[PDB]
């Protein structure tokens, strides 16, 4: 990071969302259909997974942005599906709601008073109000006529409106609603009770008839169960007053079901007051158009990417778009269409997850496409989110070195040439930094790179001494124009005894295992130094122990490492009050003799 480029914004909060149809209809740039990687002669094919409009690829300019590989951050893609299907992440949630709604009235199998009760209770739970959530449950004053039920919903509405009115009126809850842990406890509990719902119930309470239940066939094809004798008679009295069915009809059911109960799911699927007033339907989770990442995340090096899975989805997609074209100019043609639906939904489910594909003989592990690729050893995040590959750091074997005052270390010249640190040229460095730029990277102490005012980075790897002096006499100079006059060059400086370096050793297990020390060059060897009382805090030895060596890249980082994470301030460990420091064997075995009486 350079302190010459300030960031003009930050991120206070983040919120989630679900891609819908029209969002990705206007999001991507081009539609790709054929399952080809690239044709011969080595150039990107049009309409392929490596389409040139999805970012630069193999030193070829992009077709969307028009820049090279370094300046093109990629572009989002999409593939078209013939029929919409669900996602493997939400299928466990849709199974509960598909086994819930009535197939005739398109409502839930409960009655309206209790469903509205849970809806208006979650209406209170959206805000930080909990004192009245249970007072509303005891409001039952007054088989059952619909008049007193509608009036009951009226008094509940006035009760909730009055509750939110007085809570928002006097300092209790903000207009955006409060969010804590105790409110999420009862929300995740009441919604979990909302999933302990009708699943153990029978006939619908709104309309007096049962409904055929669904049976999940464990990963691909929730099925529909056949009816029995004591219920077909119910099909004959409702007029008095196990089978693969289809895929899109599930959406046909969930559409009307999520329309006749919009106010309920409005509060169930929202953990905050809906200020935008949007409608939640079945088109959100039901994916109709896939999304492929840009080619920058799809480099070939072999099919070392999701290509061998997206090409399978596009292959079945091309086979099935020739099916309805075969039936246009109008049996096994129906069985292969049913199997096409099953093999294309299992295909996209194989792309997202790796626990639902039919597979084949032992594959030495299937390729991790997206999710199992996002979890290499159960949460890949531990590779690029928690622990990073830090820059400007050294690592070598340590060796004992007395005469160092318990706060410095010894750094080899080989480490005093590679590592560096930026320092802006000022009026208090014209006498010392000029010696560095004249010296150069190899001979200590010098400068390896000079950062211009225009961002361009110059180095001194293969430049001569006359060129070093040329940049020296032209080092402390005003900028080229006014827009760049605010700063000057930031000449890099390898290391000096006024710099700070933090020592670390795996496995670090306590606060004192990473201390900030001063440095001191020692042109003697290529290994690191340490003090006797210092190796006792790191729980280290000298039988070949290898530990790391970090290096800050900010002046404020030097302050924290020299005044807060310093070694002398870490004399006492915050565990039991015992100082983890002190000479170990040699300087104590000489104390019994030096401070003795038989020593004149």
């Amino acid at each position: 990071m350079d302190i010459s480029k300030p960031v003009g914004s930050e991120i206070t909060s983040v919120d989630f969302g679900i891609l819908t149809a029209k969002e990705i209809r206007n999001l991507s740039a081009k539609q790709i259909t054929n399952p080809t990687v690239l044709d011969n002669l080595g150039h990107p094919v049009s309409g392929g997974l490596y389409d040139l409009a999805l970012g630069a690829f193999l030193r070829n300019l992009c077709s969307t942005c028009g820049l090279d590989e370094k300046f093109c951050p990629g572009h989002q893609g999409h593939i078209e599906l013939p029929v919409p299907c669900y996602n493997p992440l939400f299928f466990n949630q849709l199974y509960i709601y598909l086994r819930a709604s009535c197939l005739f009235c398109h409502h839930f199998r409960l009655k309206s008073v209790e469903v509205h009760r849970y809806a208006c209770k979650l209406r209170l739970l959206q805000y930080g109000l909990i004192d009245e959530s249970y007072k509303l449950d005891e409001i039952t004053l007054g088989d059952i006529s619909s008049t007193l039920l509608n009036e009951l919903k009226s008094k509940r509405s006035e009760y909730v409106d009055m509750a939110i009115a007085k809570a928002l009126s006097d300092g209790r809850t903000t207009e955006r609603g409060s969010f804590t842990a105790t409110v999420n406890d009862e929300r995740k509990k009441l919604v979990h009770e909302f999933h302990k719902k009708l699943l153990s119930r029978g006939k619908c309470d709104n309309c007096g008839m049962f409904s055929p239940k669904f049976r999940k066939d464990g990963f691909t094809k929730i099925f529909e169960t056949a009816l029995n004798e004591k219920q077909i008679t119910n099909n004959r009295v409702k007029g008095f007053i196990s089978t693969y069915i289809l895929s899109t009809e599930v959406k046909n059911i969930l559409d009307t079901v999520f329309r006749k109960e919009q106010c309920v799911l409005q509060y169930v699927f929202h953990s905050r007051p809906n200020l935008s007033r949007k409608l939640v339907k079945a088109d959100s989770f039901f994916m109709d158009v896939l999304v492929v990442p840009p080619t920058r995340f799809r480099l070939p090096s072999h099919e070392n990417s999701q290509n061998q899975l997206l090409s399978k989805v596009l292959t079945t997609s091309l086979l099935i778009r020739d099916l309805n074209d075969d039936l246009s100019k109008l049996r096994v043609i129906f069985s292969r269409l049913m199997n096409a639906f099953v093999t294309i939904q299992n295909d996209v489910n194989a792309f997202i997850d790796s626990t639902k594909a039919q597979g084949r003989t032992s594959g030495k592990v299937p390729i991790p496409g997206v999710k199992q690729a996002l979890e290499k050893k159960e949460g890949l995040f531990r590779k690029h989110m928690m622990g990073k590959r830090v820059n400007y750091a050294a690592r070598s074997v340590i060796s004992p070195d007395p005469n160092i005052e318990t706060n410095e270390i010894g750094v080899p010249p080989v480490f005093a040439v590679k590592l560096t640190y930026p320092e802006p040229v000022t009026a208090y460095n014209i006498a010392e930094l000029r010696q560095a730029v004249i010296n150069g990277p190899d001979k200590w102490p010098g400068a390896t790179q000079i950062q211009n005012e225009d961002g361009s980075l110059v180095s001194l790897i293969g430049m001569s001494v006359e060129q070093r002096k040329a940049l020296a006499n032209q080092l402390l100079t005003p900028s080229s124009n006014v827009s760049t006059h605010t700063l000057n060059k930031k000449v890099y400086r390898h290391i000096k005894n006024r710099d700070v370096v933090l020592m670390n050793r795996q496995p670090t297990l306590h606060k004192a295992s990473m201390m900030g020390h001063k440095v001191r060059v020692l042109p003697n060897e290529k290994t690191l130094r340490l003090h006797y009382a210092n190796t006792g805090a790191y729980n280290a030895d000298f039988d070949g122990d290898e530990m790391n060596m970090h290096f800050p890249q900010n002046e404020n980082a030097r302050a924290e490492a020299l005044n807060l994470a310093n070694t002398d301030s870490q004399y006492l460990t915050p565990t039991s009050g015992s100082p983890v420091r002190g000479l170990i064997q040699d300087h104590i075995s000489a104390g019994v003799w030096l401070t003795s009486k038989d020593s004149f």
Binding site: K5, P6, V7, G8, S9, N481, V482, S483
Partner: protein
């Protein structure tokens, strides 16, 4: 050029445009031309002089 150091991050016109006549424009130009020369600003001041002469006289 085209950086947060040179260009503002967020800009918003505070109040609706209230019209000013030629007298206010003439007083404005004559005020902050004497109050600007108290490197690239000279090329801009030379363009303020043109609108200051035309709305006052003939070139």
């Amino acid at each position: 050029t085209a950086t947060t150091l040179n260009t503002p991050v967020v800009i918003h016109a505070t109040q609706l445009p209230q019209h000013v006549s030629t007298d206010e424009v003439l007083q404005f130009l004559e005020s902050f031309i004497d109050e600007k020369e108290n490197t690239n600003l000279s090329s801009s001041i030379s363009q303020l002089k043109r609108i200051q002469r035309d709305f006052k006289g003939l070139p």
